[PDB]
Amino acid sequence: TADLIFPSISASIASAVGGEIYNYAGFFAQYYEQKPESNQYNTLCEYTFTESSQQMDYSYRILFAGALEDAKQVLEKTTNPADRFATTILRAYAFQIMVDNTSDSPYSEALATPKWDTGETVYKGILGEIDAAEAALDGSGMDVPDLIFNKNIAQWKGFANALRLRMYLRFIDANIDAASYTEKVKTLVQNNEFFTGDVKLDCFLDETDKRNPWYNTNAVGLTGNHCAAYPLVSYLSSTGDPRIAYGISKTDADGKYVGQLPGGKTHMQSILGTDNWKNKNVSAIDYSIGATKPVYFFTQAELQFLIAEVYARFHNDDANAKSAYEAGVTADFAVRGFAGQENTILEGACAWSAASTQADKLNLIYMQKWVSLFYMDHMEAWSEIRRTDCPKLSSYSAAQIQASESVYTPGELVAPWTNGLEAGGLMKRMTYPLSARQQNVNTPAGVPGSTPVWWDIK
Numbered sequence: 001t002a003d004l005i006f007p008s009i010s011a012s013i014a015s016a017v018g019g020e021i022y023n024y025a026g027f028f029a030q031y032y033e034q035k036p037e038s039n040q041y042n043t044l045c046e047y048t049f050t051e052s053s054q055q056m057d058y059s060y061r062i063l064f065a066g067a068l069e070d071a072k073q074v075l076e077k078t079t080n081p082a083d084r085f086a087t088t089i090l091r092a093y094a095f096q097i098m099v100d101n102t103s104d105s106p107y108s109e110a111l112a113t114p115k116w117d118t119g120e121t122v123y124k125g126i127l128g129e130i131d132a133a134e135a136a137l138d139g140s141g142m143d144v145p146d147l148i149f150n151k152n153i154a155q156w157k158g159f160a161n162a163l164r165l166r167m168y169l170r171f172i173d174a175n176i177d178a179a180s181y182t183e184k185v186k187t188l189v190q191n192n193e194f195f196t197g198d199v200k201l202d203c204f205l206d207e208t209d210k211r212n213p214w215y216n217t218n219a220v221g222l223t224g225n226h227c228a229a230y231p232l233v234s235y236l237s238s239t240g241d242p243r244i245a246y247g248i249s250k251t252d253a254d255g256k257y258v259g260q261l262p263g264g265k266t267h268m269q270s271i272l273g274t275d276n277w278k279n280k281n282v283s284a285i286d287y288s289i290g291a292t293k294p295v296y297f298f299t300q301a302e303l304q305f306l307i308a309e310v311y312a313r314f315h316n317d318d319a320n321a322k323s324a325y326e327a328g329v330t331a332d333f334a335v336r337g338f339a340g341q342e343n344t345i346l347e348g349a350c351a352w353s354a355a356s357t358q359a360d361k362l363n364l365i366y367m368q369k370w371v372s373l374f375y376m377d378h379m380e381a382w383s384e385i386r387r388t389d390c391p392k393l394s395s396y397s398a399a400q401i402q403a404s405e406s407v408y409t410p411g412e413l414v415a416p417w418t419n420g421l422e423a424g425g426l427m428k429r430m431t432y433p434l435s436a437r438q439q440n441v442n443t444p445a446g447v448p449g450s451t452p453v454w455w456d457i458k
């Protein structure tokens, strides 16, 4: 029955987007890095994983054999338009995740050997689906058990509108129907019919098979492999940001906040000596907050930063851009347990008044969005980095920065010191699932990780 199936959709999405995908995207967003004394995530850190590494095979199966199949069954089993609306929104989000990883995705033929549609085709289709499902709402309430919004239809509408905001911006910055999507995005923000709170699955317990999936994999089935990465530490330390203490531990060697250069683990050991670059010399990622931590689909902070971006870029409305910016920073301060301390940066290093040009203001928005997605929604962080290209890629190599840290601009990304990409640069996509290669001859030919997804054109 639909009631028994519908909860599995978001559970399955959460397992992927909050677990395996969240994990590798945090390396690509340069929040964290491989602890010196272990090797579990070397190939993610150094961009040396390949299609055979199967880095997203589990997530692909749980998204398509799990979440999307469950959504198909709900849509077959209920006429309740509000339930169909929520289901269609989750279905759209699953496709959005997949497209943001491999660009192409099974869609028109999904759910044998389906063809993989182009990501632009998928974005267009799922947006049309949300539109149609919304228009079919008749005012009656939901019937399915809804751990995300407790059957609150206005919230599901807000989620749909936030996903529209996210995806319209990607058309705009892909220069695809940019004029049209700009008008749609301006209207969306003017209507201000977004969600309150965060969009999250929040039922995780510190018990066997009930923990947050990222915590479960990395702190229970593994010993902790994550240390903080140099860009995040540098930026939080530079901006005097008290959120440096949330999810990041001071070094045991000296009680300092220390981030490892991306892909730089083996080089630190080489340059400094292996005995002088141990786990105690770098900031651990703190797993103690993770066991019961929700899985995020859409944070309020991100939503506000996207609204701020729209006001700054398309309305030329500085006052509403500042309000949404500060709202975003304020919300993230609250979620991390620092409510009321947001002025430490809103009246300090990251004050809107201190930014003069639109570029300076957009940098604030983009940098503060990136901070807010750390330990919340890494997949989205990696996507927003790819779309906006902010934080900017440092002009200096990891070795140059290690040799003379004064050249570095805190918060800029750093191409991994060891970098398996033949072209160098940042990771632009994930490989096609190996299971798809083995079972579906229509799976697009593999391309290097430097080949961008369709909406990433610069």
Ligand SMILES: [Ca+2]
Pocket: 385, 386, 387, 388, 389, 456, 457, 458
């Ligand atoms: Ca880009």
